[PDB]
């Protein structure tokens, strides 16, 4: 059907790759299988190798590298790729170890990214940026400050963009009057070789009088729209300056991402609920 081609300015070397996003099922990553097309004259003696970088940046903390000899020799998609090219097309096949920082970066260089590097040399080039990706596979909180605050969420998996509905129940038996209620989202993106991130904040002047019950639902939605002027924000892997989502919620070695909805009463008893913010597999 479709395949990604890339060759050097000399073009003597080409790499054909089925995908440029690799799905980490958490037990078997989509193996990086591609095909190297070469001309015998431009290589002659020198060998040809292909490498799978697992860089970590911020600093080039290249957390992993592995080499495959395109030539000398050492799948059906590779078969079909070869049938159109001949002998001088040779397959490479890396297997991604799962325990890698799944493709993520930071919104401005920094970040994390795999890479397919094909090069011809006698001894140990096309630079194909790839990514590892993960697809999305009932928190409840009660606090008794008596100023009782209870928060709940419909479910723990909220697709990117999908709005989050927070059930708030405030039983104010104390003498302090609530001046605001804030349902906010904190996006914890810890660079482990963690920071509070205010993205969405539905501040409502919903005041609950003494010995009174205030029960209702907020709807707050995290969107990249207003998260544009947020440096250090964790985005998903950007292949060549596209645009992408908010760094999906990691399912736990590099950058760790979690998300929490914080219900805070401005009297400041606060509670928090962790939720998942990953895409759905089509």
């Amino acid at each position, epitope marked *: 059907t479709r395949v990604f081609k890339k060759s050097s300015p000399n073009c003597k070397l080409t790499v054909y790759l089925g995908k440029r996003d690799f799905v980490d099922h958490l037990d078997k990553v989509d193996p990086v299988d591609g095909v190297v097309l070469v001309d015998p004259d431009y290589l002659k003696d020198r060998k040809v190798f292909v490498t799978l970088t697992c860089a970590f940046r911020y600093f080039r903390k290249d957390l992993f590298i592995a080499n495959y000899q395109a030539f000398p020799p050492t799948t059906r998609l590779q078969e079909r790729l070869l049938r159109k090219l001949g002998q001088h097309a040779h397959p490479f096949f890396f297997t991604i170890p799962q325990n890698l920082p799944c493709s993520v970066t930071l919104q401005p260089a920094c970040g994390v990214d795999f890479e397919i590097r094909a090069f011809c040399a006698k001894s140990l080039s096309v630079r194909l940026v790839i990514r590892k990706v993960q697809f999305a596979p009932q928190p409840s909180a009660e606090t008794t400050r008596s100023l009782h605050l209870e928060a709940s969420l419909d479910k723990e998996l909220y697709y990117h963009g*999908e709005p989050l509905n927070v059930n708030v129940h405030v039983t104010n038996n104390s003498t302090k009057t609530v001046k605001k209620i804030k349902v906010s989202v904190r996006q914890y993106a810890d660079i482990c070789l963690q920071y509070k991130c205010p993205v969405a904040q539905v501040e409502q002047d919903d005041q609950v009088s003494p010995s009174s019950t205030f029960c209702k639902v907020y709807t707050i939605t995290p*969107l990249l729209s207003n998260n544009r002027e947020k440096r250090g924000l964790a985005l998903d892997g950007k292949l060549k300056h596209e645009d*992408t989502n908010l760094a999906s919620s990691t399912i736990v070695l590099g950058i760790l991402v979690s998300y929490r909805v914080k219900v805070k009463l401005v009297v400041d008893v606060s509670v928090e609920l962790p939720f998942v913010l990953m895409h759905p597999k*089509p």
Partner: antibody
Amino acid sequence: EVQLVESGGGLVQPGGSLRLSCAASGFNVSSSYIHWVRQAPGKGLEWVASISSYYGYTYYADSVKGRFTISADTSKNTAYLQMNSLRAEDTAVYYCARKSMYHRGWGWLSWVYGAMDYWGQGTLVTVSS
Amino acid sequence: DIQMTQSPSSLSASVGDRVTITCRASQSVSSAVAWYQQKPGKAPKLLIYSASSLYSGVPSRFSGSRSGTDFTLTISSLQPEDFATYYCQQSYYYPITFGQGTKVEIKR
């Protein structure tokens, strides 16, 4: 199943204004580029404008720029098109359809603006002094 | 903008005909074209995306393909029910543009 519900159609003198609501079911205003198109009386389609929430991306036709302004409300899962300075030519039946940002295989394809594949039923927009 | 010119302005054909409408993009396009079959009154429908991808539910008699900036839409068996106007639209750039429709009349 996916639907758009188009409403907000009634008379308006030249230079007046209108607001169009497109309530989205089966999807979100944030995982979709929502497009408002219009067909003049017995004439050919013309894409008016479209938006994406997740990015706050907005696009308008050259002849419907400034006069129109699109946005949305993800609380109710709805899209809104504010048509200001409605003029005689603007008359049409106005339709609402959407470009699902999905189908990239994994995530949002921010650079397709693909085919408007789910059309509503279209509300008649008039302009007459 | 991008003047997505279309031809013919209107064509005549009865049941069983093999209709062919040619949509040429003044500027380059990269398989971004859609052909909308608007009946009189009802709202446009999707037929073609990618210049050649059969949208789900479109009868298999419908098809299209790309030959450069000249995309083309073909209807193997122009049934009595598939009469409408057919607009071609470059969904590639912004501002989007549609064709100018090619009414498929009936013949007598």
